[PDB]
RNA sequence: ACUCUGGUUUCUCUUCAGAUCGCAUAAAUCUUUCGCACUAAAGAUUUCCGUGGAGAGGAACAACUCUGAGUCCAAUUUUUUGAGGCCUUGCUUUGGCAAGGCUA
C-alpha cells in the first residue's frame, strides 16, 4: 500500500550482477551492493560501455536514481517470492 | 481537479497527441487520478511512420501532450462538482 | 488500479521516450509506474532483437504499452 | 505545507488574486486566449475549466505550427480539446484591439 | 444438551480459589520425577519396585540374580563398589545400569 | 569459551523473556536490569576468553536479540523501531534504534532523547518504548481477554476473528504476538550483519581448521571460496537412516 | 413426544403376561441409571 | 464507506471413527505363563457404560456482529518537463530513419 513491488525486486537484486543504463546512454554492468527505495544504486566492479562503444573498468559507482532509464536484473529473481 | 473530469469521459472515441508527436486514435476505457490513460480499439500514428492498428493501449499520464474531444460532449454537466 | 492488474503476465510491448521498444512479459508495476518485465527483448530501429531478460525500467522513460501476446503456460 | 486545513479554498484565491487569475478571467469574461506550447506550437482558443496544474479544456481552437523547405506556418482546426498544464511555455489573453 | 461451556476469567479465578483445598498447588511435573507413568512402566517391565510405588508380579519368567554363574565378565572381584546401584539408578538409565532391557519406557527428563 | 576459541562470530539471543513477565512478574525496570546484567555477564566472559575487543555484545550494535519462542516473539531494537515506523511513517527506524537502550531517556516536551532523565520518575527509553508495550500486551491478553482485549487489539491494529478469540490463553497469546510482531526479521538482521558469509569467513576457517595453513596453494583457492575451483568438502557428522 | 403427568405413574405403581415379563430383563440398567443420577450433597 | 451467503438451539435417523474416540476406566470368554489364580501377569475376542466426524429428516427463534464475497500528491526522487531548432554521412519507404557534431 506504500512501497511498490518493483522497488522490492530491486532490493532483492543486491549482491548479484546488474547492468545499468542511464539517460546519457552509458551502460554499467557490475555487482549491485546496495539500493534504496529510490533507484539510487551503489554498484561495483563496473564494465562501462559509453555511447560510442568504449569499454572501461571502474570499481565503485553510485548512480542517482532519477537518472536510470531501465535496470536489467538477473533471471533467478524471476523466482522471488515477491514475484508470486 | 480536472483529471476527475477526464475520468468521467469513459467510453468515448478520442485522439491523443504525445510529446513524441504520436497520434493515437481510440476509445478511452480508463483514466487514473494521475491522468494515466488506457485506450481500446486504438489507431496509433507515430509521426514519421505509417499508422498501425491495435486492440488495447496504455499511455503514461506524464507523456500525454494534449487531448482531442469530439463534438457531442456535454462538457458543462461533466465539469460540475 | 485494476486497469493494469488485468494486464499482468501478458506479453507487453512498451514504447520508450527515445523510441526504444521493449517486448516482454508484464510482471509488476507500482505507483511511479516502474515496470517489471521478464524474458524481455528490445526492438530498435534497422531491425534487430537483443534478448535482455528481467528489466526494471524507471517510470520516467516509459511512454506507451500494448498487449502483443497472450500469457504463456 | 503550513496550511494543511481540510477547508482549502486558497487555490481559488490563487485564481482570483494570484497569477492564475488571468485564465479565470477568460473563464468568466470568455475572451480568446493564445497559448504557446513546448513543441514550438501556438494555440488560440477559449478556456472553460482548469486548476493549479494549469491543465485546461478549450473549445473552437486554431493551432498553427511552422515546418521547414523553409518555415511556412500551417493551421488546423480543433473543435474541443484539453491541454496538459506542464506542456506550455506562456499563456496569453489576447490584447484589446478595439 | 449441556455439552460445552465457555467461561470468563473472573469466574475461573473464583472457581480456582474455592477448590484449592482439593488442589496440589504444584506448578511443575518435576515433583513426579522417577515417580510417574513411564517410571512405573519401566519398573514393572524390569520386575523392580520403586520405594513407595506399586509392586507388580514378574512380567515374564526369565533368568534370576542367582542364576548367572561367575564369568570373567560380571566377576565381582573386578568391581569397584562406591555406592550401590539402587533400583532408581536402573530406572533412570534403563540401557546403562541394566542387562536385557525390554518394554523400557524412557522417562521424561528434566523440565 | 569454545566458540571464541574456534574463532567464530558470537551473537546472543536472550530467549524466554516472557518468564520475566508471566512467571517472575518483575517490574519493567527490573526486567531491564536483569537483561542488562545478562548481557554484561556474557560480555565479561567473552573478554575473559578473548583478547581483541571487536566482539562487544550489545543490543545497540544489533548483536543481542530478545525473544520468546513459545509466544512467537522475536525482536531486535531495529525491528521494533521498524514496527513503530510502519505504524507512524515519518520516523527513521535505524536512528530510532540507536536510542532504545542504555541510560538514555525520552523527553516528551522537547521530543528528543537525552542522556539525563527529565526531572524524576522518568523511565529509560527501552522501558518506555519496548518493555512497557510488551508488558501491557501480555497483561491484557492474560487478564482482560473478555473485558478490554478487543479495544487494545484495535489500538495495535490486530483484528482477530470470533472463533480466534475463543482460544485458550496460551494459544491466544501466541496468536496475538504473532500478529503484532510477524516474522523473525530481527534474528535475520542479527545474523546478516554480524555473521560472516562463507566467502568472507572462509579465511579464518582455513587458517584454523586446515592442516596445510592458509599460505598453501590449495589453501588460497579454498580461502577464495570459489565454486569453480578444486573440490574440498569437509564432513563432521554422520547420520544413519532409520534402517 | 408426550410428557405424561407425574400423577399417572404414581397411581399405576401404587395399584400394582409376557409384556410384564419381557421388561424385567433390564432391571440392572434401571439400577445403574438410578445410582448414576444420585443427588449431590448441596442439592435437597 | 453500498449489496448476497452462511446462523444458533432442539428431537430423531444413517454411516465412519486405533483419535487420551473416554485428561475416565468395568465385566465375560479363550489361549499362554508360571504358581499350587480375587488376593497374578501376558495376548486375543466379545459385551457393556457413552462419545466424536460427516450426512439426512423434523421444529424453535435470530436474521447481517462475525466468516467472507460482490463493491488529501505542480518547484530535484518518478505523474504537471529542458522541451525544441541547425549541420554531415549510408539508405531514401523522397515521408524521412540511424549515428555524430551542434544552438538553445
From Swiss-Prot, chain A:
Signal peptide range: none
N-acetylserine: residues carrying this PTM: 2
Reported modifications of this chain: Methylated on arginine residues by PRMT5 and PRMT7; probable asymmetric dimethylation which is required for assembly and biogenesis of snRNPs.
One Gene Ontology term of the molecular function aspect: U7 snRNA binding
Sm domain residues: 5-77
Keywords carried by this UniProt record: Acetylation, Cytoplasm, Methylation, mRNA processing, mRNA splicing, Nucleus, Repeat, Ribonucleoprotein, RNA-binding, Spliceosome
Single GO biological process annotation from the record: spliceosomal snRNP assembly
GO cellular component terms given for this protein: catalytic step 2 spliceosome; commitment complex; cytosol; methylosome; nuclear body; nucleoplasm; nucleus; pICln-Sm protein complex
Location within or outside the cell: Cytoplasm, Cytosol; Nucleus
Subcellular location, principal: cytoplasm
Family statement: Belongs to the snRNP core protein family.
Complex formation: Core component of the spliceosomal U1, U2, U4 and U5 small nuclear ribonucleoproteins (snRNPs), the building blocks of the spliceosome. Most spliceosomal snRNPs contain a common set of Sm proteins, SNRPB, SNRPD1, SNRPD2, SNRPD3, SNRPE, SNRPF and SNRPG that assemble in a heptameric protein ring on the Sm site of the small nuclear RNA to form the core snRNP. Component of the U1 snRNP. The U1 snRNP is composed of the U1 snRNA and the 7 core Sm proteins SNRPB, SNRPD1, SNRPD2, SNRPD3, SNRPE, SNRPF and SNRPG, and at least three U1 snRNP-specific proteins SNRNP70/U1-70K, SNRPA/U1-A and SNRPC/U1-C.
Note, other: In the autoimmune disease systemic lupus erythematosus, antinuclear antibodies are developed with Sm specificity.
Gene assigned in the entry: SNRPD3
UniProtKB/Swiss-Prot annotation, chain B:
Single Gene Ontology MF annotation: U1 snRNP binding
PTM info: Methylated on arginine residues by PRMT5 and PRMT7; probable asymmetric dimethylation which is required for assembly and biogenesis of snRNPs.
Keyword Nucleus set for record: yes
Ranges where the Sm domain occurs: 1-73
Region of interest (Sufficient for interaction with CLNS1A), residue spans: 1-79
Domain of life according to the entry: Eukaryota
Primary location: cytoplasm
Localization (cell): Cytoplasm, Cytosol; Nucleus
Any GO BP: U2-type prespliceosome assembly
Family: Belongs to the snRNP core protein family.
Assembly and oligomerization: Core component of the spliceosomal U1, U2, U4 and U5 small nuclear ribonucleoproteins (snRNPs), the building blocks of the spliceosome. Most spliceosomal snRNPs contain a common set of Sm proteins, SNRPB, SNRPD1, SNRPD2, SNRPD3, SNRPE, SNRPF and SNRPG that assemble in a heptameric protein ring on the Sm site of the small nuclear RNA to form the core snRNP. Component of the U1 snRNP. The U1 snRNP is composed of the U1 snRNA and the 7 core Sm proteins SNRPB, SNRPD1, SNRPD2, SNRPD3, SNRPE, SNRPF and SNRPG, and at least three U1 snRNP-specific proteins SNRNP70/U1-70K, SNRPA/U1-A and SNRPC/U1-C.
Miscellaneous comment: In the autoimmune disease systemic lupus erythematosus, antinuclear antibodies are developed with Sm specificity.
Name this polypeptide is given: Small nuclear ribonucleoprotein Sm D1
Species assigned in the record: Homo sapiens (Human)
Parent-protein residues present: 2 to 82 of 119
UniProtKB/Swiss-Prot annotation, chain C:
Post-translational modification as stated in the protein's UniProt record: Methylated by PRMT5.
Residue ranges occupied by any Sm domain in the UniProt entry: 1-71
Family affiliation: Belongs to the snRNP SmB/SmN family.
Job of this protein: Plays a role in pre-mRNA splicing as a core component of the spliceosomal U1, U2, U4 and U5 small nuclear ribonucleoproteins (snRNPs), the building blocks of the spliceosome. Component of both the pre-catalytic spliceosome B complex and activated spliceosome C complexes. As a component of the minor spliceosome, involved in the splicing of U12-type introns in pre-mRNAs. As part of the U7 snRNP it is involved in histone pre-mRNA 3'-end processing.
Further facts: Patients with the autoimmune disease systemic lupus erythematosus (SLE) have autoantibodies directed against some of the individual snRNP polypeptides. The most common autoantigen is called Sm. B/b' bear Sm epitopes.
Disease / disorder: Cerebrocostomandibular syndrome: A syndrome characterized by severe micrognathia, rib defects ranging from a few dorsal rib segments to complete absence of ossification, and intellectual disability.
Official protein name in the record: Small nuclear ribonucleoprotein-associated proteins B and B'
Organism whose genome encodes this protein: Homo sapiens
Lineage, highest ranks first: Eukaryota, Metazoa, Chordata, Craniata, Vertebrata
Residues of the full protein shown: 6 to 88 of 240
UniProtKB/Swiss-Prot annotation, chain F:
Membrane-crossing residue ranges in chain numbering: none
Location(s), subcellular: Nucleus
Residues at which GTP binds: 15-18
Lineage top rank: taxon: Eukaryota
Subunit structure: Component of the U5 snRNP and the U4/U6-U5 tri-snRNP complex, a building block of the spliceosome. The U4/U6-U5 tri-snRNP complex is composed of the U4, U6 and U5 snRNAs and at least PRPF3, PRPF4, PRPF6, PRPF8, PRPF31, SNRNP200, TXNL4A, SNRNP40, DDX23, CD2BP2, PPIH, SNU13, EFTUD2, SART1 and USP39. Component of the pre-catalytic, catalytic and post-catalytic spliceosome complexes. Component of the minor spliceosome, which splices U12-type introns. Within this complex, interacts with CRIPT. Interacts with ERBB4 and PRPF8. Interacts with PIH1D1.
Family the entry assigns: Belongs to the TRAFAC class translation factor GTPase superfamily. Classic translation factor GTPase family. EF-G/EF-2 subfamily.
Clinical disorder: Mandibulofacial dysostosis with microcephaly: A rare syndrome characterized by progressive microcephaly, midface and malar hypoplasia, micrognathia, microtia, dysplastic ears, preauricular skin tags, significant developmental delay, and speech delay. Many patients have major sequelae, including choanal atresia that results in respiratory difficulties, conductive hearing loss, and cleft palate.
Name under which the protein is recorded: 116 kDa U5 small nuclear ribonucleoprotein component
The gene coding this protein: EFTUD2
Amino acid at each position: 500500500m506504500s512501497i511498490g513491488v518493483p522497488i522490492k525486486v530491486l532490493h532483492e537484486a543486491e549482491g548479484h550482477i546488474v547492468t545499468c543504463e542511464t539517460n546519457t546512454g552509458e551502460v554499467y554492468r557490475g555487482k549491485l551492493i546496495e539500493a534504496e527505495d529510490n533507484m539510487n544504486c551503489q554498484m561495483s566492479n563496473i564494465t562501462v560501455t559509453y555511447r560510442d562503444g568504449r569499454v572501461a573498468q571502474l570499481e565503485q559507482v553510485y548512480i542517482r536514481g532519477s537518472k536510470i532509464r531501465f535496470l536489467i536484473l538477473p533471471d533467478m529473481l524471476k523466482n522471488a517470492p515477491m514475484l508470486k | 481537479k480536472l483529471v476527475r473530469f477526464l475520468m468521467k469521459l469513459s467510453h468515448e472515441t478520442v485522439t491523443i497527441e504525445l510529446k513524441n508527436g504520436t497520434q493515437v486514435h481510440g476509445t478511452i476505457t480508463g483514466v487514473d487520478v494521475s491522468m494515466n490513460t488506457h485506450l481500446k480499439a486504438v489507431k496509433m500514428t507515430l509521426k514519421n511512420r505509417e499508422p498501425v492498428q491495435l486492440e488495447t493501449l496504455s499511455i503514461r499520464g506524464n507523456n500525454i501532450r494534449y487531448f482531442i474531444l469530439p463534438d457531442s460532449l456535454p462538457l458543462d454537466t461533466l465539469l460540475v462538482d | 488500479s485494476s486497469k493494469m492488474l488485468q494486464h499482468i503476465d501478458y506479453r507487453m510491448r512498451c514504447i520508450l521516450q527515445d523510441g526504444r521498444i521493449f517486448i516482454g512479459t508484464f510482471k509488476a508495476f507500482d505507483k511511479h509506474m516502474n515496470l517489471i518485465l521478464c524474458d524481455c527483448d528490445e526492438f530498435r530501429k534497422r531491425e534487430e532483437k537483443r534478448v535482455l531478460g528481467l528489466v526494471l525500467l524507471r517510470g520516467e522513460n516509459l511512454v506507451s504499452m500494448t498487449v502483443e501476446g497472450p500469457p504463456p503456460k | 505545507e503550513m496550511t494543511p486545513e481540510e477547508l482549502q479554498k486558497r487555490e481559488e484565491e490563487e485564481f482570483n488574486t494570484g497569477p492564475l487569475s488571468v485564465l479565470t478571467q477568460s473563464v468568466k469574461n470568455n475572451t480568446q486566449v493564445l497559448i504557446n506550447c513546448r513543441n514550438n506550437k501556438k494555440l488560440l482558443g477559449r478556456v472553460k475549466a482548469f486548476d493549479r496544474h494549469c491543465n485546461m479544456v478549450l473549445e473552437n481552437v486554431k493551432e498553427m505550427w511552422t515546418e521547414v523547405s523553409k518555415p511556412v506556418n500551417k493551421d488546423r482546426y480543433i473543435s474541443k480539446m484539453f491541454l496538459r498544464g506542464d506542456s506550455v511555455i506562456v499563456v496569453l489573453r489576447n490584447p484589446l484591439i478595439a | 444438551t449441556y455439552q460445552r461451556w465457555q467461561f470468563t476469567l473472573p469466574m475461573m479465578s473464583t472457581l480456582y480459589r474455592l477448590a484449592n483445598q482439593l488442589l496440589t498447588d504444584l506448578v511443575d511435573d518435576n515433583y513426579f520425577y522417577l515417580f510417574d507413568l513411564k517410571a512405573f512402566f519401566t519398573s514393572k517391565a524390569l520386575n523392580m519396585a520403586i520405594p513407595g510405588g506399586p509392586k507388580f508380579e514378574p512380567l515374564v519368567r526369565d533368568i534370576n540374580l542367582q542364576d548367572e554363574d561367575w564369568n570373567e565378565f560380571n566377576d565381582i572381584n573386578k568391581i569397584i563398589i562406591r555406592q550401590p546401584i539402587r533400583t532408581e539408578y536402573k530406572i533412570a538409565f534403563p540401557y546403562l545400569y541394566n542387562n536385557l532391557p525390554h518394554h523400557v519406557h524412557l522417562t521424561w527428563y528434566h523440565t | 569459551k569454545h566458540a571464541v576459541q574456534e574463532r567464530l562470530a558470537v551473537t546472543v539471543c536472550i530467549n524466554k523473556i516472557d518468564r520475566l513477565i508471566l512467571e517472575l512478574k518483575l517490574p519493567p525496570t527490573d526486567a531491564y536490569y536483569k537483561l542488562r546484567h545478562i548481557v554484561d555477564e556474557v560480555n565479561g566472559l567473552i573478554s575473559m576468553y578473548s583478547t581483541d575487543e571487536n566482539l562487544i555484545l550489545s543490543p545497540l550494535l544489533g548483536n543481542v536479540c530478545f525473544s520468546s519462542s513459545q509466544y512467537s516473539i522475536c525482536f531486535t531494537l531495529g525491528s521494533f523501531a521498524k514496527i513503530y515506523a510502519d505504524t507512524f511513517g515519518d520516523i527513521n527506524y535505524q536512528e530510532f534504534a540507536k536510542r532504545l537502550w542504555g541510560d538514555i531517556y525520552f523527553n516528551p516536551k522537547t521530543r528528543k532523547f537525552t542522556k539525563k532523565a527529565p526531572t524524576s520518575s522518568s523511565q529509560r527509553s527501552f522501558v518506555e518504548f519496548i518493555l512497557e508495550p510488551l508488558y501491557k500486551i501480555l497483561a491484557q491478553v492474560v487478564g482482560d481477554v473478555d473485558t478490554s482485549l478487543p479495544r487494545t487489539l484495535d489500538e495495535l491494529g490486530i483484528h482477530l476473528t470470533k472463533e480466534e478469540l475463543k482460544l485458550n490463553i496460551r494459544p491466544l497469546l501466541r496468536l496475538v504476538c504473532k500478529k503484532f510482531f510477524g516474522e523473525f526479521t530481527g534474528f535475520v538482521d542479527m545474523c546478516v550483519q554480524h555473521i560472516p558469509s562463507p566467502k568472507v569467513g572462509a579465511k579464518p576457517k582455513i587458517e584454523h581448521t586446515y592442516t596445510g595453513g592458509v599460505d598453501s596453494d590449495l589453501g588460497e583457492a579454498m580461502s577464495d571460496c570459489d565454486p569453480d575451483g578444486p573440490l574440498m568438502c569437509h564432513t563432521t557428522k554422520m547420520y544413519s537412516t532409520d534402517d | 413426544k408426550e410428557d405424561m403427568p407425574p400423577e399417572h405413574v404414581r397411581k399405576i405403581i401404587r395399584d400394582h403376561k409376557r409384556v410384564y415379563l419381557g421388561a424385567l430383563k433390564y432391571m440392572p440398567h434401571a439400577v445403574l441409571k438410578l445410582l448414576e443420577n444420585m443427588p449431590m450433597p448441596w442439592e435437597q
